[PDB]
């Protein structure tokens, strides 16, 4: 019910267009003379065109019945605007002019959503009237925000139109359901502090609540005090200048209309097939030959996306996946220079459309495309390899506009890490940013250091394997959108810690893998995080071939027969579990060790020669973690007496299990598998090292070791103590360094879950600190008992 409150908020907007009605008409004449024919080259009134712009901003953008409004409003205009076609082409040309005033972008659609969005937000933040955008993932609101960010700078604009306009300085606040009103009060006071002391005619700041649709019904009621903050600037003080602040309230959720009726609801609609194929044209318009080569696939992809998005009840898929499919087939058509073989289409639709269990997206996309049927099987491992290790030619031409999104793996019980640093991470290991579990650490300093490490990995250009996202979804969301700001040919994502959003450099080849569990990603992630990140499933079965499944079943029954011994030397009835004999067995370790065996083989072909040696080498790594009383008990076991003799000979002649130091002399003399960093954890039943055992180990390791240092996890309350001890160990001179990290489990202390944190911290330190000449051997010893703690 904005009767007689939109006209007094619209005469001011008409006055704003009428005051600036001197250069806009010259810009329109130049744009319609240099890009159109002579029919759009008529004299335009400075006041009637301003009136059409005023009614196009005040009423035409918010409505979904725009044709009825245009045919019911054109009967009052004079001769040059008698028809609705004239108003349509006029608002289209001015929106295209405001898009052309922005910096030039490649592979970005010229759809009505982007131009309409940037039109309304620019005109609404010159006039300090709040914008309240709503929509769904793929509606181009954040992409229009980042366009306004680098388009309408005051004296440094790309065009001569925005140079005469105001300067913007945006502060962001990604709202959450657990958001206090003091946060938005502090945001409004902070942007008032930016606005204080500057000229108001050439400097305006805006707040952007990027997820305001989350916090509408929190029991603390955070969005109830936004009503004065949009009108008088602040609460419990007199009205004053440098307090009224503009607002672009971008939301992915539908809002409450009663307290947001003060602004303009630019409510975005669901995409039809015409808008989808227009966006498909806009994200292929950068080239003209392969556009006309792959124009035929746009309508079947649009129909298949429509059937996929209408099939599922939960909004798991969005427009971002279809746009990424269009960009990927465009890049493959440009690089191929011959057309599109159907394996490219199947690879694109399986790399992009994935993640949901009850979705056969390949069958749906080949239902409308019967020609692109691929009868050969494709697995997840080559998809992950082609998404993490791309081709050399990709992102090598003039600027980057076509690439993939940031990968995500869907797993259970944290299994992705083993298969990631076994299979795919080749050459350079990534930096694992993770939730360090050292006691009494502060979480704020931890996430500050984590995002600093992410920024350093972005600047230096190395992969990021995140293991937490609930602490970083508010603080890393802009980098995941894969939109860049260019300054001298260098990309710039936005990073923020609370209320401090600054740009950070991005290298040419930078990947970011997120690892999360299936339950938390399916009922804890808010759902726009799903659309940004490319989904994949590599938990345990997709990499494991059926012959390796036969081998893991055979090794499970072989370990069960290894642990099964019958004897009458001692009169007792004690059944030995495979966890008793093979220490650490948890009915899942046979799959990990067959993965280790098939990668230690390295040839990967079934000619009946590789099968027996991968089976026997898997059996070797099982017996390599066997307690010696079991391997001398093996003579009366179910396996036999010649097999037991061969396994005892393997345990006592080939593998050195006598002591720690003998394992050191057996480990250093052999040249390894082209690795500058050999890691090995050790399970001990004896007492750990005291401080004089490392001295004698240096005494008979005088020619190989470099004074190994022992580290106890009891003494390390804070991460920085472990960091300074490891860093002091790296900076010592000499090669072939030895590290011994000890931890005890059978005592009153808590430190048993700190092992993984210490291991990942050691990997991060050796990745960020080691040079190119020094070999490093890190050993992790742990103390366990035979009284049930084993």
């Amino acid at each position: 019910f904005v009767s007689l409150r939109d006209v007094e908020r619209c005469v001011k907007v008409f006055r704003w267009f009428h005051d600036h009605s001197d250069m806009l008409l010259k810009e329109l004449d130049k744009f319609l003379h240099e890009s159109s024919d002579s029919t759009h080259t008529f004299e335009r009134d400075p006041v009637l065109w301003s009136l059409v712009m005023a009614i196009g901003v005040c009423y035409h953008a918010s409505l979904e019945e725009k044709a009825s409004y245009r045919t019911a409003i054109a009967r009052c205009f004079p001769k040059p605007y008698n028809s609705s076609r004239a108003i349509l082409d006029e608002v289209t040309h001015v929106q295209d002019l405001f898009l052309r005033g922005a910096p030039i972008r490649t592979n970005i659609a010229r759809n009505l959503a982007l131009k309409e969005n940037v039109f309304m937000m620019v005109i609404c933040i010159e006039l300090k009237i709040p914008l309240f955008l709503v929509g769904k993932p793929g509606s181009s609101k954040s992409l229009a925000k980042i366009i306004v960010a680098d388009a309408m700078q005051g004296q440094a604009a790309f065009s001569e139109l925005f140079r005469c306009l105001k300067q913007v300085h945006l502060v962001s606040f990604q709202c959450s359901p657990h958001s206090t009103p003091q946060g938005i009060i502090s945001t409004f006071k902070q942007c008032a502090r930016f606005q204080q002391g500057k000229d108001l005619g050439q400097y305006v700041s805006v707040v952007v609540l990027d997820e305001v649709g989350l916090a509408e019904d929190s029991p603390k009621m955070p969005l109830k005090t936004l009503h004065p903050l949009l009108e008088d600037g602040c609460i419990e003080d007199d009205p004053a200048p440098y307090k009224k602040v503009g607002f672009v309230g971008i939301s992915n959720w539908a809002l409450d209309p009663a307290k947001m009726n003060r602004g303009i609801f630019v409510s975005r609609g669901s995409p039809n097939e015409k808008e989808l194929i227009e966006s498909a044209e806009g994200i292929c318009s950068s080239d003209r030959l392969v556009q006309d080569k792959i124009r035929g696939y746009f309508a079947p992809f649009a129909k298949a996306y429509e059937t996929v998005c209408q099939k599922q009840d939960k909004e798991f898929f969005g427009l971002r996946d279809y746009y990424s499919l269009i960009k990927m087939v465009f890049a493959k058509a440009k690089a191929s220079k011959r057309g599109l073989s159907p394996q490219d289409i199947t690879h694109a639709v399986l790399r992009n459309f994935s993640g949901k269990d009850n979705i056969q997206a390949l069958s749906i996309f080949t239902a409308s495309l019967p020609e692109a049927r691929y009868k050969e099987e494709v697995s997840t491992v080559e998809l992950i390899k082609q998404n993490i290790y791309p081709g050399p030619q990709a992102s090598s031409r003039g600027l980057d506009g076509a690439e993939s999104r940031y990968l995500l793996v869907l797993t259970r019980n944290y299994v992705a890490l083993q298969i990631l640093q076994q299979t795919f991470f080749e050459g350079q290991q990534p930096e694992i940013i993770f939730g360090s579990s050292f006691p009494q650490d502060q979480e704020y300093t931890q996430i500050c250091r984590n995002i600093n490490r992410v920024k350093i990995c972005m600047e230096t250009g190395k992969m990021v394997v995140l293991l937490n996202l609930q602490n970083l979804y508010e603080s890393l969301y802009d980098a995941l959108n894969q939109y860049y700001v260019y300054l001298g040919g260098q990309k710039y994502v936005d990073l923020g810690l609370g209320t401090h959003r600054v740009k950070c450099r991005v290298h040419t080849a930078f990947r970011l893998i997120v690892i999360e569990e299936k339950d938390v990603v399916y009922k804890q992630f808010p759902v726009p995080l799903i659309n940004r990140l490319e989904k994949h499933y590599l938990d345990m079965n997709t990499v494991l071939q059926p012959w390796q499944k036969s081998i893991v079943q055979e090794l499970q029954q072989w370990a069960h027969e290894f642990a099964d011994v019958k004897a009458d030397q001692f009169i007792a009835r004690h059944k030995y579990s495979p966890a008793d004999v093979f220490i650490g067995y948890h009915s899942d370790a046979c799959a990990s060790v067959v993965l280790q065996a098939v990668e230690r083989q390295g040839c990967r072909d079934l000619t009946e020669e590789l099968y027996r040696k991968v089976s026997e080498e898997a059996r070797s790594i099982l017996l390599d973690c066997a307690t010696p009383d079991a391997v001398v008990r093996l003579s009366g076991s179910s396996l036999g007496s010649f097999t037991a003799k061969q396994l005892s000979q393997e345990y006592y002649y080939a593998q050195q299990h006598n002591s720690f130091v003998d394992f050191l002399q057996a480990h250093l003399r052999m040249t390894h598998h082209e690795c500058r960093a050999v890691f090995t954890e050790i399970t001990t039943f004896s007492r750990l090292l005291t401080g004089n055992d490392c001295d004698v180990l240096a005494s008979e390791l005088r020619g190989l070791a470099s004074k190994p240092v022992v580290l106890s996890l009891q003494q390390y309350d804070t991460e920085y103590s472990f960091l300074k001890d490891v860093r002091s160990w790296l900076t010592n001179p000499g090669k072939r360094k030895v590290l011994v990290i000890q931890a005890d489990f059978d005592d009153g202390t808590r430190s048993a879950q700190l092992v993984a944190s210490a291991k990942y911290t050691a990997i991060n330190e050796i990745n960020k600190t080691q040079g190119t000449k020094d070999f490093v051997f890190v050993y992790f010893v742990t103390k366990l008992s035979r009284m049930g703690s084993g």
């Binding site: 004296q155 440094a156 604009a157 790309f158 015409k274 194929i277 003209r288 030959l289 006309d292 080569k293 124009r295 035929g296 696939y297 309508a299 079947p300 220079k337 057309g339 239902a367 409308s368 019967p370 020609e371 003039g398 009494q440 650490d441 502060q442 704020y444 300093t445 500050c448 250091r449 995002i451 600093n452 920024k455 350093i456 600047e459 260019y486 300054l487 001298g488 040919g489 260098q490 710039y492 990073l495 810690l497 609370g498 209320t499 401090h500 600054v502 740009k503 950070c504 450099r505 012959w547 036969s550 079934l606 000619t607 009946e608 099968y611 309350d717 804070t718 920085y720 103590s721």
Partner: protein, 910 residues
Amino acid sequence: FEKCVIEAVSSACQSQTSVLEGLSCQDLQKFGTLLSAVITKSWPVHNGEPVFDVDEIFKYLLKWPDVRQLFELCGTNEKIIDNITEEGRQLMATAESVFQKVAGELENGTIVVGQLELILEHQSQFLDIWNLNRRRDVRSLLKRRRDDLLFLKQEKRYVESLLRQLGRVKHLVQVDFGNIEIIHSQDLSNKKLNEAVIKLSYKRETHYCLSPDIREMASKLDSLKDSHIFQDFWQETAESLNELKVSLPEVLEYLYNPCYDNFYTLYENLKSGKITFAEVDAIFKDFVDKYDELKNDLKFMCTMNPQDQKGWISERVGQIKEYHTLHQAVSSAKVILQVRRALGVTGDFSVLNPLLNFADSFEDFGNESPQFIKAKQLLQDISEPRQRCLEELARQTELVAWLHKALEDINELKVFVDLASISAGENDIDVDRVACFHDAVQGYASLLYKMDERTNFSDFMNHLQELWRALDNDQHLPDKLKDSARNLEWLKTVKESHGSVELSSLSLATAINSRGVYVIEAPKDGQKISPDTVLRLLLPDPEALRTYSTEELKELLNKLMLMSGKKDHNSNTEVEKFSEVFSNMQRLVHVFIKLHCAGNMLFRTWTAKVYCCPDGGIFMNFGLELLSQLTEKGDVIQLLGALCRQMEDFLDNWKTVVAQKRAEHFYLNFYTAEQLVYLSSELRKPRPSEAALMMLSFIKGKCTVQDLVQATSACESKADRYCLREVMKKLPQQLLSEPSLMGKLQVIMMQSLVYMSAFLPHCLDLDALGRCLAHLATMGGTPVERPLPKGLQAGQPNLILCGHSEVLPAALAIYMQAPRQPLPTFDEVLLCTPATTIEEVELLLRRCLTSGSQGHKVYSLLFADQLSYEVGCQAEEFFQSLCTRAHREDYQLVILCDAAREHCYIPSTF
């Protein structure tokens, strides 16, 4: 040996190695056991024998090679099939019935075409198995069916090319596709007998192509779907119809035939070379410097009319290439005249006048213009790029005027970059502006600094040669020129900059590490003791000082956490040092506020000025006139870590000792920790505060200062005066035996734990408070007696489920069983609410099971289901704890809960 060899068969058939290709195995019993083994251990299990079908067994038969050898050798002799098993012969019979059904379905057309693609991919194995089935025509029948399959696949290709060609104009004119719109979308799980290779000849399919006209149309569109020129003609003649739902037979006449006529006139024009330049630069404009696709496109272009392509392709591709390089040379000449004008160099060129006099000329022929070729020998190899570099030079005139005005030479750049790197910001765009400007002017210094005002053409191209060498190392250089040219306002402010008083976000951290004094105060003002207002930080200099709060520290930490990469050790080691001393100091604030909120009264006046200086030290102080100043130098990090460790140890010891002090005194369990602190502060005064009188009136009743001074005058004897003076004597000789601070700190916290009242000579200890409250309650007699009702056990918890509307009347119904008793008070009843502290229910459990109480009372826990998960779980552990330790077995604990909310913790586990 039978069991190990069947397991070896299973392991070698589990791999993809064929077992029997060298077996001369004339003992037929063991051979039949091996045959039973290879059948039952090679059969396609799918988590353990489902088959139920025909396709997977048939794929199994065609792909694995031992099956044909199996059927050959068991069909060789009947003395081998008699001794297999009962099971293996059943599976061989099932496979043979499946193969007989399938390859007897080839004799008619009823065969599913999936099996047809399988047998044509697997020709030799199918021929072998069929020749063995022959002993219980096939070459020509397979070639006939293969020819009909290839015709079907090419007809599906023709029809699919037709749907995609008519789908690229779906916005303009829409077509009703007869019946073909459904027939084409359906899969090929369809019977082959529906594709009707009849006689008297033609071969109609389920795609009912309405004539051979649309069939030959689809063939010509399939041969011409990769011609971009044809697609251009298609869309420019299908815009000639305008919203019309149209049928397929008039699509051939209203839309296809004029397109074909235009395409055929263009073809017979291009075969001669009579085409004019207007269509040449109107159609081929998007092919500039991409001539291999155009060679392929003219090859595909002459596949329409099937004759030779020898003297037609290469001369006209070269002619169009010469035309394209001609127009590129024209645009390059216009931009080089624009940069010769805008740079101010007058010079002399005199060789590009007839090229521009040709640029406004117009001729109509397709022939090679000769006299310009030598002129264009000056501009052969510029590129289609690098003309962009000349137009950002020729369009940015304000920057080249400012560079001739303000810098004037190459040699001031090395001092200008250093003068700008101070005045630039701290974020990464602001820093990288200097390097973009530097690389821009180092890339254009060959032109903007080395030109004479009158240069000839030869040395001008000689300098553009090394300009292009400088451009070859950096493709992003004109964007660097543009992004430097849009920073002219910054470049004007740099030189005339006064002292810009903003220190930094980096050197502020160095100032904190140089003279920052972290101060914990625990303020004595009227504000609360929140963790924001206990931590301060001071920066001295002149003589002014700056006080930093916690949130300003967090904001500056966020600011300095996201700077650009200096790639030097000092910056990241000082921000790491500041961040970790701040984290350790905040950990100290956390442990100190835990010890304050637990109630300590020793560190209520504590302060600790912590210096961040190298060898700065920690200067603690107390508000006591019987203690000295504690100070110790050294490094800050591990000393604050150790100090927080003994402070946490003192927290655990203080919690344990206050637990065992609550376990001994009963009247001390009425009041919480802060009320105990208030009472210990207020009872020592000669006139105590009236809030303490009212809050102690629940114990005595009509509390009076005369009764209070009588109760506190006889609560302690004169031997404690000896004990406290012994504390004052023995400690100054004890702190001097330890030179460090940690040992004397441990000594003073032990001595405050065991003998508390000597350190604070203005407050009562918990023994004196408990004795005074016990004497006060002993003075006020006639205690309350309350029995439990009938059916209520007086030694066990009584969980009662009443319902939400009848909890509150039921409690008063319980308490009204004894008439003439006084109404209850804040003891024995807790109206539980969401967000209830664990301390109040813990003190209730201390109240109802403490031995010295001189009476029986009914203790109620109303609305006990309203507790949280953690609070209810900790209350359960606490009740189990004190029932384990020590209690009286005649307590009356009554629990009332809502009966409609039984899914929570505490009534379900009770």
